[PDB]
Design a protein around this motif. Structure first.
Motif, PDB file in Angstrom:
ATOM      1  N   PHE A   1      11.764   6.642   1.163  1.00 18.10           N
ATOM      2  CA  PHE A   1      11.069   5.718   2.049  1.00 18.10           C
ATOM      3  C   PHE A   1      11.540   4.269   1.917  1.00 18.10           C
ATOM      4  CE2 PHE A   1       7.828   3.780  -0.801  1.00 18.10           C
ATOM      5  CZ  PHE A   1       7.862   4.662  -1.869  1.00 18.10           C
ATOM      6  N   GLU A   2      11.093   3.461   2.876  1.00 17.72           N
ATOM      7  CA  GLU A   2      11.597   2.105   3.073  1.00 17.72           C
ATOM      8  C   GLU A   2      11.110   1.147   1.988  1.00 17.72           C
ATOM      9  OE1 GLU A   2       9.256   3.611   4.912  1.00 17.72           O
ATOM     10  OE2 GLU A   2       7.751   2.197   5.689  1.00 17.72           O
ATOM     11  N   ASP A   3      11.850   0.044   1.819  1.00 17.13           N
ATOM     12  CA  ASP A   3      11.358  -1.062   1.005  1.00 17.13           C
ATOM     13  C   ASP A   3      10.223  -1.729   1.759  1.00 17.13           C
ATOM     14  OD1 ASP A   3      13.388  -0.695  -1.030  1.00 17.13           O
ATOM     15  OD2 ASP A   3      14.798  -1.697   0.359  1.00 17.13           O
ATOM     16  N   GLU A   4       9.019  -1.645   1.201  1.00 12.15           N
ATOM     17  CA  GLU A   4       7.829  -2.074   1.925  1.00 12.15           C
ATOM     18  C   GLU A   4       7.844  -3.573   2.192  1.00 12.15           C
ATOM     19  OE1 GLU A   4       4.303  -0.514   0.289  1.00 12.15           O
ATOM     20  OE2 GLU A   4       3.232  -0.755   2.193  1.00 12.15           O
TER      21      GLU A   4
ATOM     22  N   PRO B   1       0.789  -1.244   0.000  1.00 10.30           N
ATOM     23  CA  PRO B   1       0.000   0.000   0.000  1.00 10.30           C
ATOM     24  C   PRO B   1       0.816   1.288   0.000  1.00 10.30           C
ATOM     25  CG  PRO B   1      -0.049  -1.074   2.152  1.00 10.30           C
ATOM     26  CD  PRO B   1       0.559  -2.065   1.207  1.00 10.30           C
ATOM     27  N   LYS B   2       1.918   1.376   0.752  1.00  8.64           N
ATOM     28  CA  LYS B   2       2.665   2.636   0.800  1.00  8.64           C
ATOM     29  C   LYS B   2       3.338   2.927  -0.538  1.00  8.64           C
ATOM     30  CE  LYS B   2       6.013   5.254   3.631  1.00  8.64           C
ATOM     31  NZ  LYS B   2       6.928   5.253   4.814  1.00  8.64           N
ATOM     32  N   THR B   3       3.846   1.891  -1.198  1.00  9.83           N
ATOM     33  CA  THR B   3       4.519   2.081  -2.475  1.00  9.83           C
ATOM     34  C   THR B   3       3.513   2.393  -3.572  1.00  9.83           C
ATOM     35  OG1 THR B   3       6.086   0.500  -1.599  1.00  9.83           O
ATOM     36  CG2 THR B   3       6.229   1.031  -3.958  1.00  9.83           C
ATOM     37  N   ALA B   4       2.370   1.698  -3.558  1.00  8.28           N
ATOM     38  CA  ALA B   4       1.340   1.963  -4.552  1.00  8.28           C
ATOM     39  C   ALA B   4       0.741   3.358  -4.388  1.00  8.28           C
ATOM     40  CB  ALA B   4       0.235   0.900  -4.482  1.00  8.28           C
TER      41      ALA B   4
END
Length: 164
Positions: free
Chosen positions: A82-85, A29-32
């Protein structure tokens, strides 16, 4: 429920076609959400007008550097890289949409579309979507790239946004 976004591609300013993407928000969800928001421009910045600056045929098309236009820039919607989800999804063939990065937990706005299976990237780049329609347009884009990635024509995202 997974969002769909589109890119309207141009080549030296002339329309080429549309390519849409399913964004796997159910799994990353965060990457999308990052890619969706940059595609709508709803934070005041994003992909509209940016270029695909590195295209290597048989390999991938890389874009999303909307700040320096050459692979050295770009920024997320979160105010920092940001981080690798997670690495749940794998690089399984053409059409895979994945995040570029400069090492662990350095995601910004740059992404690439795979035009072949790239399993050596598994666990290094977060896969978060896949081409839905317009793979033929990415194949037409690929023909303007070269062995070292330089494009022979300017490949730009003339318009972009959210579908449905």
């Amino acid at each position: 429920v997974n969002p769909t976004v589109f890119f309207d591609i141009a080549v030296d300013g002339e329309p080429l076609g549309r390519v849409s993407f399913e964004l796997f928000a159910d799994k990353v969800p965060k990457t999308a959400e990052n890619f969706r928001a940059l595609s709508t421009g709803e934070k005041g910045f994003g992909y509209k007008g940016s270029c695909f600056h590195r295209i290597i045929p048989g390999f991938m098309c890389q874009g999303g550097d909307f700040t320096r236009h050459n692979g050295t820039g770009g920024k997320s919607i979160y105010g920092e890289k940001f981080e690798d989800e997670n690495f749940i999804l794998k690089h399984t063939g053409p059409g895979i949409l994945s995040m570029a990065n400069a090492g662990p937990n350095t995601n910004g706005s740059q992404f690439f579309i795979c035009t072949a299976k790239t399993e050596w990237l598994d666990g290094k780049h977060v896969v978060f979507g896949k081409v839905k329609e317009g793979m033929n347009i990415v194949e037409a884009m690929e023909r303007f790239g070269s062995r070292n990635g330089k494009t022979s024509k300017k490949i730009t995202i003339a318009d972009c946004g959210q579908l449905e």
